[PDB]
Amino acid sequence: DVVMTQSPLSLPVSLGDQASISCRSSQSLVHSNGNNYLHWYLQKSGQAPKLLIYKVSNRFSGVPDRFSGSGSGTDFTLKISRVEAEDLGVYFCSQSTHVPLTFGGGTKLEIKRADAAPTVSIFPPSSEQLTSGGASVVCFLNNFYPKDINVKWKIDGSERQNGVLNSWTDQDSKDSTYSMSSTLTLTKDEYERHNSYTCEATHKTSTSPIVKSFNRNEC
Amino acid sequence: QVQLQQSGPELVRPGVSVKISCKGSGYTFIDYAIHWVKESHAKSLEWIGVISAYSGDTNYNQKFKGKATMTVDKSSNTAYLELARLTSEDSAIYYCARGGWLLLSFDYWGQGTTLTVSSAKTTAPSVTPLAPVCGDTTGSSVTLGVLVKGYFPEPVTLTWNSGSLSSGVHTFPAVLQSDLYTLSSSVTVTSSTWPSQSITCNVAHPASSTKVDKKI
């Protein structure tokens, strides 16, 4: 099973700039009639993959003149001269030279912008959810870049944590940042047996962790 | 133009079976073959097999045999993939592709399907309002939010002030907890213009639902 390894997974490129993606296989893809049956597909958010190049270098119908294809056997590379707005997405490569077919891991091409620190916000339980019997504490760390961050919940200093639900957005269309939400869910019982609730984020915009917390509900 | 009209989407329970189609047009049907690809939430793509032309029929990729079964229907240009013994571990997007020779490989795809395998019944959300951060955390811009937890199935609509507050909103991808889903959204605005009770959170879950206000 020819594993196709493709790097990088993420490539922050400024638009206007030129980019290149490596795709590599564990067995030469040169078939007995002589062709490398390697291919590159582009899957845009919410659409179905579309072919972009076949053999190693062939552009498909109406693929813009800016994508090249190069390689042989085990090493192959897609290069684009001017990265454009309609080019962000995940590039895939496949090999048809051997059955079954395999697809490389994918390379999501994003925009490269400047570091922005998350705006962090913590919210106590809705006074009308307690009435149900559950007690969630939500925390939003909005508008930061790069995407790397790690959020931790501390209840009375301890970070015992497992009931966390995290969710993330994709790169915003305007400021090119990300946004995340973290929710530590507990019960009204568990919750009313403790005091402070902290939320803290670790991101390359600060050598100190960003901390947020409040106090109360007990006994 | 060549076109393949798959027809989905399916929401089904464990251990059941579903057959999903691919209808080809714009070309000589019997001069090619239909391949099927699994798009995991783990998002790498996976080939499961091919039927017709060159072939390794019924279903035939190491992982998928006996699991899926592939059949054809030349009279009405339709391919059929049949998954059964369905589990949640089989929730994915299934693509159908025309397998082209030396004008090399998958030159046309289907729109994809989406299959949701769950045990959860139709459950309407509990939506509850998120008011200003610690309460002492209102100085220059404030952020407010709304939790939409515990519904089934997707999607849910969620606006702020009928659609008129769009700037600065951020709504999250619904994530799945224990059979049911949850969603959150936050709006940041200038500090001097709220607590007027000028912000209401609007949620709509098609199996009948409606909206909450951020008080004082």
Side-chain angles (χ1 to χ4, degrees):
Chain A
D1 282 70
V2 175
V3 279
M4 302 305 296
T5 270
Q6 190 184 340
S7 59
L9 304 337
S10 165
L11 192 291
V13 71
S14 325
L15 269 50
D17 273 56
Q18 53 181 219
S20 317
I21 306 155
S22 263
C23 182
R24 291 162 156 271
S25 50
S26 42
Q27 299 165 216
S28 195
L29 306 181
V30 201
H31 173 241
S32 4
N33 63 358
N35 307 252
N36 290 295
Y37 297 86
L38 192 93
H39 313 298
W40 289 76
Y41 304 80
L42 209 189
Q43 194 182 240
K44 302 180 133 301
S45 314
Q47 288 183 39
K50 188 163 300 186
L51 182 64
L52 203 76
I53 266 193
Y54 62 99
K55 189 273 94 55
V56 156
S57 55
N58 305 16
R59 283 178 284 99
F60 180 58
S61 298
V63 171
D65 190 24
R66 36 188 173 77
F67 297 79
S68 295
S70 311
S72 289
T74 51
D75 251 276
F76 314 100
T77 312
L78 185 78
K79 282 183 168 175
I80 323 177
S81 73
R82 278 182 40 71
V83 170
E84 279 178 11
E86 50 169 4
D87 294 350
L88 298 342
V90 180
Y91 289 71
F92 288 94
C93 56
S94 189
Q95 65 77 36
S96 318
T97 302
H98 314 83
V99 170
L101 293 74
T102 47
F103 287 93
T107 309
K108 190 175 60 59
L109 197 132
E110 52 165 277
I111 330 288
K112 163 61 162 299
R113 63 97 65 197
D115 293 5
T119 300
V120 183
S121 311
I122 182 173
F123 295 94
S126 20
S127 348
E128 58 170 272
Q129 172 190 189
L130 278 41
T131 271
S132 324
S136 309
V137 198
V138 187
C139 186
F140 297 121
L141 303 79
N142 293 313
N143 298 81
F144 59 96
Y145 186 88
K147 197 170 188 167
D148 261 334
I149 198 168
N150 185 39
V151 178
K152 230 61 185 64
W153 292 84
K154 284 183 175 178
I155 299 181
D156 292 341
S158 318
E159 66 135 297
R160 161 78 296 128
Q161 309 301 60
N162 61 87
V164 175
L165 294 91
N166 296 346
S167 188
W168 292 265
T169 54
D170 325 332
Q171 207 172 30
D172 185 273
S173 53
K174 317 111 59 205
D175 49 300
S176 301
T177 44
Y178 299 90
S179 294
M180 187 205 128
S181 52
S182 191
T183 313
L184 174 78
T185 308
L186 301 184
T187 53
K188 224 278 285 85
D189 199 300
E190 228 92 282
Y191 173 73
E192 295 191 319
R193 292 197 296 100
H194 305 308
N195 179 17
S196 64
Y197 294 76
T198 311
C199 157
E200 55 163 84
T202 312
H203 184 265
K204 69 176 298 192
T205 47
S206 306
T207 224
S208 279
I210 304 188
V211 182
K212 268 280 164 292
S213 39
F214 59 89
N215 280 91
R216 303 282 42 86
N217 207 334
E218 90 302 286
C219 187
Chain B
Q1 68 292 2
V2 175
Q3 175 291 153
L4 280 157
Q5 105 81 2
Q6 302 194 217
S7 304
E10 242 99 22
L11 200 192
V12 298
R13 212 201 188 284
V16 176
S17 54
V18 64
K19 178 189 291 179
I20 55 183
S21 292
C22 192
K23 312 172 191 295
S25 329
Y27 67 107
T28 299
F29 191 35
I30 74 285
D31 258 62
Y32 282 108
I34 305 311
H35 298 54
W36 297 89
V37 185
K38 202 200 195 87
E39 190 201 338
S40 59
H41 196 280
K43 283 192 69 294
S44 196
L45 294 166
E46 296 179 285
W47 183 68
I48 92 172
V50 62
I51 189 191
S52 187
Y54 51 153
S55 260
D57 312 305
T58 334
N59 199 274
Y60 224 49
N61 161 19
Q62 324 196 145
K63 318 203 73 181
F64 296 98
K65 71 187 201 68
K67 172 150 43 174
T69 292
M70 300 175 287
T71 308
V72 284
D73 223 81
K74 185 190 164 189
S75 43
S76 295
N77 285 359
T78 302
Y80 299 99
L81 178 71
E82 182 150 29
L83 306 171
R85 318 182 302 101
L86 281 166
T87 34
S88 44
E89 290 171 78
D90 282 302
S91 308
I93 294 187
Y94 298 100
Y95 292 112
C96 65
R98 194 174 88 179
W101 273 266
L102 280 156
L103 287 310
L104 295 95
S105 57
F106 298 173
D107 49 275
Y108 292 105
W109 289 68
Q111 336 88 314
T113 47
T114 312
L115 173 62
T116 297
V117 199
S118 193
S119 295
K121 45 282 299 174
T122 299
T123 301
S126 298
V127 41
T128 49
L130 302 179
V133 190
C134 328
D136 309 291
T137 329
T138 304
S140 208
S141 283
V142 242
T143 309
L144 316 176
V146 140
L147 195 60
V148 180
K149 83 177 285 73
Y151 59 104
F152 189 77
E154 291 246 59
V156 104
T157 316
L158 170 34
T159 53
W160 290 97
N161 283 336
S162 299
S164 67
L165 277 174
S166 55
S167 312
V169 169
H170 289 297
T171 301
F172 288 94
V175 102
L176 183 66
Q177 184 51 191
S178 47
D179 240 356
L180 319 176
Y181 299 86
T182 292
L183 194 158
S184 283
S185 182
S186 49
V187 61
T188 303
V189 295
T190 304
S191 283
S192 316
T193 56
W194 181 85
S196 313
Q197 303 158 119
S198 33
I199 298 190
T200 301
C201 176
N202 318 311
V203 70
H205 179 237
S208 325
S209 274
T210 18
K211 38 99 280 295
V212 275
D213 169 85
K214 258 112 310 299
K215 248 175 286 196
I216 341 188

